Amino acid sequence: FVAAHTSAGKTVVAEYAIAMAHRNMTKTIYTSPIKALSNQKFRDFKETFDDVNIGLITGDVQINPDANCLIMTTEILRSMLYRGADLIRDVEFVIFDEVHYVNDQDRGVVWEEVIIMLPQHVKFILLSATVPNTYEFANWIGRTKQKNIYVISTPKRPVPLEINIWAKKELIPVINQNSEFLEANFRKHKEILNGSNKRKFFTQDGPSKKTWPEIVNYLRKRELLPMVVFVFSKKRCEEYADWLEGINFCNNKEKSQIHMFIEKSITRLKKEDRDLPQILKTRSLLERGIAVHHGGLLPIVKELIEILFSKGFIKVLFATETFAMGLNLPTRTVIFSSIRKHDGNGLRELTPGEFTQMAGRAGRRGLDSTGTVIVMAYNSPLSIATFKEVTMGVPTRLQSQFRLTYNMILNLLRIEALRVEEMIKYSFSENAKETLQPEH
């Protein structure tokens, strides 16, 4: 059970997952909830390893039928244990990607329905963002399954970073490379920040159209490239992008290279699909220098953008939350434009885990291991307690994922082997299972 951080050598377990299995003659499944990630880590597996039979399952049909190392979605994984698949015989060590999703209810109940319902011979290999509740999770899956495990933690980052605040074009360091809370600088920033009716947009927050290039160009004189910015709203991403002008990250040769590379991507589709307005704009942006990444963009637009950025060409980027889950990363700096977002319910501050997943991504590894981070503030005071619960605060504990889907119930009552009650009472919610069942 790996409790570590991304962009800090988490693939060490993924490297020996196949390398052990390929010599010893077992198989391995890499199980990621996001489809983009599946493609990403597939690419990674193609790259790093030396002649390995890799595979990836999609809706239409499987790429590489006779694969040694398959890749699949959690839903598709679940569809082995109910259907009776070929590769639950051959697989021994199943890899599990990102089990800090173990808190989220709406999607992540599949992990309870698969990990607890795995076969007897199959054993656990996990990968996750750091959490304080380490002992309780692994031991639970250990105790119920009756499998020996160790808490392989990674409490502090071997690839660290520093965190700053933006105010009147300034870098005010609240936290440095060694993770020391500077109380004086926080005092400093607020002391600096001491008839406009709402005709268009809200009266305060969201900066002017010639602020963004000021933010950009100032960092390019100091030369803290590459940088990334995290804008949430899909309209606002576009808006905050299109205000920028006079800025090109590729020379006339590299521009031509970009043109050629896009020309491959476009070749797949029809002329009607090639000449989309969205793709035209995208083409312009890539040629211009920068790019955008939100879920509202198309599959061919997103993945391509991710590649071209990760090639090391685009050094200023605008992107969503899900973008943080990537493969290759040229980022010396990561910036938060806002700390507000609308995840289903309403206005809610981003949880410390989310802060980590995003801000902890800012390290390079193999150039400058101490990464830069700067949070934006547009002529307004920061809420100290909230800020520190986001910045310093602990990523909250793993909360149980129970959601009785009727399909599951129908499957179980059809199959009848392993009855539903037995599943239910022994499920993740603890009660004389992990703690103190000998005293019964």
Tell which positions 36-55 bind other proteins, by CB under 8 A.
Answer: 39-40, 42-43, 46, 51-54
Q: Which stretch binds other proteins (CB under 8 A): 139-147, 158-166, 183-191, 393-401?
A: 139-147
Write the interaction track for other proteins spanning residues 149-188; mark x where CB under 8 A is met and - where it is not: ----------------------------------------
CB 227 within 8 A of CB 219: yes
200 lines the binding site for other proteins (CB under 8 A)? no
Q: Which stretch binds other proteins (CB under 8 A): 1-9, 221-229, 363-371, 418-426?
A: 418-426
In the chain, breaks (C-N over 2.5 A) are found after 194
CB 303 within 8 A of CB 36: yes
Cα pseudo-dihedral 289, 290, 296, 302, rounded to 10: 70
- Cβ 94 to other proteins shortest distance, Å: 12
Q: Is 296 known to sit in a ligand binding site?
A: no
Helix (H, G, I), strand (E, B) or coil at 62: coil
CB 149 within 8 A of CB 139: yes
Task: Please give the single-letter amino acid code of residue 399.
Answer: Q
423 lines the binding site for other proteins (CB under 8 A)? yes
CA distance 98 to 335: 23
Write the interaction track for other proteins spanning residues 384-413; mark x where CB under 8 A is met and - where it is not: -------------------x-------x--
Q: Quick one: tokens of 320?
A: 């969503």
| Residue of 127, 2, 7 whose CA lies nearest to 370 | 7
268 lines the binding site for other proteins (CB under 8 A)? yes
301 lines the binding site for other proteins (CB under 8 A)? yes
Helix (H, G, I), strand (E, B) or coil at 119: coil
CA distance 373 to 7: 15
299 lines the binding site for other proteins (CB under 8 A)? yes
346 lines the binding site for other proteins (CB under 8 A)? no
CA distances, 137 to each of 97, 115, 149, 303, 425 (Å): 15, 12, 11, 34, 17
Torsion 382-385-390-393 (CA) sign: positive
Q: Which stretch binds other proteins (CB under 8 A): 178-186, 210-218, 273-281, 368-376?
A: 273-281
Q: Is 294 known to sit in a ligand binding site?
A: no
Q: Is 35 known to sit in a ligand binding site?
A: no
Helix (H, G, I), strand (E, B) or coil at 401: coil
Which residue, 298 or 413, has its beta carbon nearer to other proteins? 298
- Among 26, 153, 177, 265, which residue sits at the site for other proteins (rule: CB under 8 A)? 265
Q: Which stretch binds other proteins (CB under 8 A): 10-18, 19-27, 370-378, 419-427?
A: 419-427
272 lines the binding site for other proteins (CB under 8 A)? yes
Which residue, 42 or 387, has its beta carbon nearer to other proteins? 42
Q: Is 67 known to sit in a ligand binding site?
A: no
Extract the annotated binding site for ATP. Answer: 4-11
